[PDB]
């Protein structure tokens, strides 16, 4: 079972109406485990999954201290970048940072990430070699030169290849039952008459974990890719996901069609047919 840990940080300037907004969430695979929000009363790092709730005060106090240090850097980053781009102190701007690590089926390091974005565009990113930076432009290049001097990538290579992977594996066995589990999709089809000579076949995939899935329709064994409506995998709100795929069938042809479901929780891929 391959896995990942990721930290997502969002800061938004509120020119004129206070200090900037800073949201930090952490995820192991598709399960969120902590959060910190600047506009919250506690001003603490908070558990968001039960398996993390039992960590001691040392864990919570240390991550609160670190996420609050993260928060200051990102507010300073809003002014800095506004300077780089000679912007007005009136408009709201966004900086987003993501870092984490991917491990294999063997739970050994597979790759690590460190990406920064200003106003929804890539700014600077650590490359896969965890040694060089991808500076988008001149501002990004001013930052890269600061990060090169600060021996920043080298510091990050150690975190992602070490610490990240180490705590990822600790979270994995500490939340064994939760994020080392798989929920297979509960599947089913609906059929409704859109009119006298045509109808919709909707194929459903519900209560699955993790969020990946391939839900496909085929007619006479052929792919109906451009003729299928496929929604984006939604969250159900209880830690599992949902998805559907639909085709408008000419009446009399329901039997030509098959829904195909692929998910890690399924011993064998599913092929459903309305009949």
């Amino acid at each position: 079972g391959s896995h990942s840990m990721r930290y997502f940080f969002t800061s938004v300037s509120r020119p004129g109406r206070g200090e900037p907004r800073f949201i930090a969430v952490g995820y192991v695979d598709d399960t969120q485990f902590v959060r910190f929000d600047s506009d919250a009363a506690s001003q603490r790092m908070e558990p968001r999954a039960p398996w993390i709730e039992q960590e001691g005060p040392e864990y919570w106090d240390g991550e609160t201290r670190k996420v609050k240090a993260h928060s200051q850097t990102h507010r300073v980053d809003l002014g800095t970048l506004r300077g780089y781009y000679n912007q007005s102190e009136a408009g709201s701007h966004t900086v987003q940072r993501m870092y984490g690590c991917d491990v294999g089926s063997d739970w050994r390091f597979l790759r690590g990430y460190h990406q920064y974005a200003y106003d929804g565009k890539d700014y600077i990113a650590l490359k896969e070699d965890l040694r060089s930076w991808t500076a988008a432009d001149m501002a990004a290049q001013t930052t890269k030169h600061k990060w090169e001097a600060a021996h920043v990538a080298e510091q990050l290579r150690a975190y992602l290849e070490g610490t990240c992977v180490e705590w990822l594996r600790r979270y994995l066995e500490n939340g064994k039952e939760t994020l080392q589990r798989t929920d297979a999709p509960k599947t089913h089809m609906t059929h409704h008459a859109v009119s006298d000579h045509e109808a919709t076949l909707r194929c459903w995939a519900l209560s699955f974990y993790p969020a990946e899935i391939t839900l496909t329709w085929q007619r006479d064994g052929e792919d109906q890719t451009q003729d299928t409506e496929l929604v984006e995998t939604r969250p159900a709100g209880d830690g599992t996901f949902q998805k559907w795929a639909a085709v408008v069938v000419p009446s009399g042809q329901e039997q030509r069609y098959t829904c195909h479901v692929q998910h890690e929780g399924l011993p064998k891929p599913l092929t459903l047919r309305w009949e």
């Binding site: 952490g26 864990y59 991550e63 670190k66 240090a69 850097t73 970048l81 920064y116 975190y159 610490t163």
Partner: peptide
């Protein structure tokens, strides 16, 4: 756990 320290752009 979070990375520390964090450097400014």
């Amino acid at each position: 756990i979070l990375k520390e320290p964090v450097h400014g752009v």
